[PDB]
Amino acid sequence: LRESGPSLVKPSQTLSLTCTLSDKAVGWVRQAPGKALEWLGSIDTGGNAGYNPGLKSRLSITQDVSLSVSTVTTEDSATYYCTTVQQKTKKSCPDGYTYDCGAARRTCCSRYDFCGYSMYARADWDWYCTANYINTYEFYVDAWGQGLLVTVSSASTTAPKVYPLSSCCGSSTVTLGCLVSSYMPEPVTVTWNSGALKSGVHTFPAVLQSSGLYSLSSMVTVPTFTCNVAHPASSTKVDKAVEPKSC
Amino acid sequence: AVLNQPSSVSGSLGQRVSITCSGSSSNVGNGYVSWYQLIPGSAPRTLIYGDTSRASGVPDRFSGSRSGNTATLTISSLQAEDEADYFCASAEDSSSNAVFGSGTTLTVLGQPKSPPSVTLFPPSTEELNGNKATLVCLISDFYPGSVTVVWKADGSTITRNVETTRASKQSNSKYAASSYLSLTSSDWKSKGSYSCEVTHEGSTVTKTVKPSEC
């Protein structure tokens, strides 16, 4: 599964994403930073769509899957997931009425000899039969997407300036890095040699200085090398080379 | 309405852990719960649907159970790659309305202690082509994950302009962290030596850069 959309919207606007065949049921789950999972909405194959009652009023989901939240606030900053849902509602005769009469009568009866009777056809029908049902709901999520973090803020998308990291020439296992400094907001993705270098790579969590700007580094260990930084909020893709010091 | 879960649970490697999920008749009592696992950087993976139906790709070590209004998930033969947040879920008053548990974070103990590797990078020429100087101290490959960091300059502890990130797990299940010293270029060339002191389990590793020899 794959979600796509903007990473930063201003307060009191509408946030719209999209998921990327039609032989499934897709739902949107969101999680604020550190908080718990929060249900938003579902979409079955027939076009119906179930929503959180509290968040229905400011939510919608239409595509030929694309969601939309209204008047977003800082409390809407979350990681929005596209899931593969599998909902199911099962009507069952309220137990006691041991015999489920057919669909023509649409009733449940305590004794089978009352099933061929329409509602209230017999004067004793009320004691042994009813037309109500027990509604039991089953639900889970078949598959998940990676998630797309959307930040709500009045701040402006500042792109990072990437710097290479090399040791002073003062030897047995080389170590290089890339300093992605002063960007906003999160996240950024760092790979090495377009991903051909997967072993010995760690991309550290971000730091926040007093200026409110993020910085993070990615390190690679080796016996040239180019780190690839990408910031979706500023449409920025930098491929800065790390050339070691001569000395 | 929200499903109550313990905040965290821990066990030694190869052992069993259990996590509860206490709701009411409206939600958990009305049918069968669902479980999901969230590892940071990884998409959530469904762990159990129904009361006990094992996931489409989950091994036998994971098990489910339910008695009354509380459901429990079980993880046998603990591994190191099972440190994650686990969420229980079910429906209430609608089959397309879902409610989740408050979440539980699992940690597996007993991994071999490892000392941290430290690399201290000097400012780049391009950053010094403005007039900022950022020293970057990268800590990696340590267990357990709790280090303390002090910065020194000319035999004196630096108090101002230091930021350190909390430790986070790696792909090899050891911990890493970074610390940042943010100066101007004039301050970088002002002093004779800078040191990053990383303390972990009563043992210290120190790396030094000298602005004259870089």
How many degrees, rounded to 5, is the angle at CA B192 between CA B190 and CA B196? 105
Token pair of A87 as six digits: 């909902």
Please tell me the number of Cα atoms within 13 Å of A174 on its side-chain side: 13
- CB within 8 Å: A215 and B180: yes
CATH superfamily, with its number, for domain A161-242: Immunoglobulins (2.60.40.10)
Distance CA B59, CA B49 (A): 14
In the sheet that holds B62-67, the strands lie side by side as B17-22, B70-75, B62-67
Distance CA A75, CA A155 (A): 15
Which residues are CB-neighbours of A104 under 8 A, at least 6 positions away?
none
Distance CA A19, CA B2 (A): 28
Q: Which of B30, B95, B213 has its CB closest to that of A87?
A: B95
CB atoms < 10 A from the CB of A150, how many? 24
Position of tokens 């590797």?
B117
What technique was this entry resolved by?
A: X-ray
Q: Please tell me whether residue A128 adopts helix, strand or coil conformation.
A: helix
Asked whether B4 and B21 are in contact (CB, 8 A), the reply is yes
Token pair of B63 as six digits: 């098990």
Please give the span between the terminal C-alpha atoms of chain B, in angstroms, as a whole number: 60
Largest CA distance in chain B: 72
Query: How many Å lie between the alpha carbon of A124 and the closest alpha carbon of chain B?
Result: 32
Nearest-Å Rg of the Cα atoms of chain B is: 24
Asked whether A139 and A87 are in contact (CB, 8 A), the reply is yes
Distance CA B74, CA B62 (A): 6
Residues of A in contact with B87 (CB under 8 A): 36-37
Comparing alpha-carbon positions, the chain A residue that sits nearest to B4 is A36
Distance CA B145, CA B109 (A): 11
Helices and strands of chain B, counted as H and E runs: 1, 19
Note if the bond before A11 is cis, omega within 30 degrees. no
Look at strands B132-142 and B104-109 and give their pairing: unpaired
Q: Which of B44, B100, B121 has its CB closest to that of A167?
A: B121
Amino acid identity, residue A227?
A: C
Comparing alpha-carbon positions, the chain A residue that sits nearest to B48 is A140
- The strand pairing partners of A161, in sequence order, are A181
Decide: residue A152, CB within 10 A, 0-12 exposed, 13-18 middle, 19+ buried.
buried
- To test the contact with chain A by mutation, choose from B38, B93, B96 the residue with the greatest count of A C-beta atoms within 10 A, namely B96
DSSP string, chain A: --EE--SEE-TTS-EE-EE---SSEEEEEEE-TTS-EEEEEEE-TTS---B-TTTTTSEEE-----EEESS--GGG-EEEEEEEE--EEEEEPPTT--EE--TTTT-EESSGGGTTS-TT-STTHHHHEES--EEEEE--EEE----EEEEE-SS--BPPEEEEE-------SEEEEEEEEEEBSS--EEEEGGGT--TTEEEPPPEE-TTS-EEEEEEEEE--EEEEEEEGGGTEEEEEEEPPP--
Q: Delineate the domains of chain B, giving CATH numbers in brackets.
A: 1-110 (2.60.40.10), 111-211 (2.60.40.10)
